[PDB]
Amino acid sequence: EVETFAFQAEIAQLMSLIINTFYSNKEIFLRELISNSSDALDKIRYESLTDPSKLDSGKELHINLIPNKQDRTLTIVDTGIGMTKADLINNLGTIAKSGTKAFMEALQAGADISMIGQFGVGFYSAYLVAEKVTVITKHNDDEQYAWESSAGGSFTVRTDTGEPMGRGTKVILHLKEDQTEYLEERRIKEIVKKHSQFIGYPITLFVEK
Numbered sequence: 001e002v003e004t005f006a007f008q009a010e011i012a013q014l015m016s017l018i019i020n021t022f023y024s025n026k027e028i029f030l031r032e033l034i035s036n037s038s039d040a041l042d043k044i045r046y047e048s049l050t051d052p053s054k055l056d057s058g059k060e061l062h063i064n065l066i067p068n069k070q071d072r073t074l075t076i077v078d079t080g081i082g083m084t085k086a087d088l089i090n091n092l093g094t095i096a097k098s099g100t101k102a103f104m105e106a107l108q109a110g111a112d113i114s115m116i117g118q119f120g121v122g123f124y125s126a127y128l129v130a131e132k133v134t135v136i137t138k139h140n141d142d143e144q145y146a147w148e149s150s151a152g153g154s155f156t157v158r159t160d161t162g163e164p165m166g167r168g169t170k171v172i173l174h175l176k177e178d179q180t181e182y183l184e185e186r187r188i189k190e191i192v193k194k195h196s197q198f199i200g201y202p203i204t205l206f207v208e209k
């Protein structure tokens with residue numbers, strides 16, 4: 001059972017802008033996703049202070065970066081609070097609507113794409129480098145879901161039958177054919193050092209075989 005949904009018009013417009021605009025400083029996508037993971041980690045950590053049983057699905061709070069040249073994917077894994085089915089279909093898009101409006105206004109007034117995270121919609125910068133994004137997520141209060149979109153106005157959600165994650169989010173970037181530099185260890189190290197050096201959680205960059 002795979003459900004297909006339309007993005008709101010404003011969100012679709014934003015992802016077309018990201019895909020079609022000429023903008024060479026694509027590497028900021030990593031900083032935005034790592035920032036999202038850190039936010040999700042902060043949330044489950046704060047919740048656990050008043051309800052320790054929220055860490056029963058995994059006490060480790062961390063971020064893993066996993067390149068795979070064979071599949072041509074870069075995966076950003078966190079053990080943060082995760083997302084419910086309602087988040088995937090409703091809540092994230094509701095919030096993103098006003099952040100997109102503000103970002104798009106700032107752009108025509110002289111801002112640039114690197115400022116996207118100041119507007120709360122840094123996730124869609126993934127389409128600077130990815131032709132398709134698959135998101136696996138598990139929240140304590142819901143089932144494990146796979147979200148997916150190749151842009152083009154629509155996204156899918158299904159119950160995920162793969163390996164159980166426990167709790168957290170896995171963002172799988174299926175990289176565009178000319179963006180495989182973001183599979184290289186030295187390139188990923190450089191970007192993390194430059195843009196994410198003070199994240200308050202361990203970032204482990206896996207190496208490939």
Ligand SMILES: CCN1C(=O)CSC1=S
Pocket residue numbers: 036088092123135147169171
């Ligand atoms: C975690 C992945 N993601 C967002 O951050 C906004 S929509 C979506 S799926």
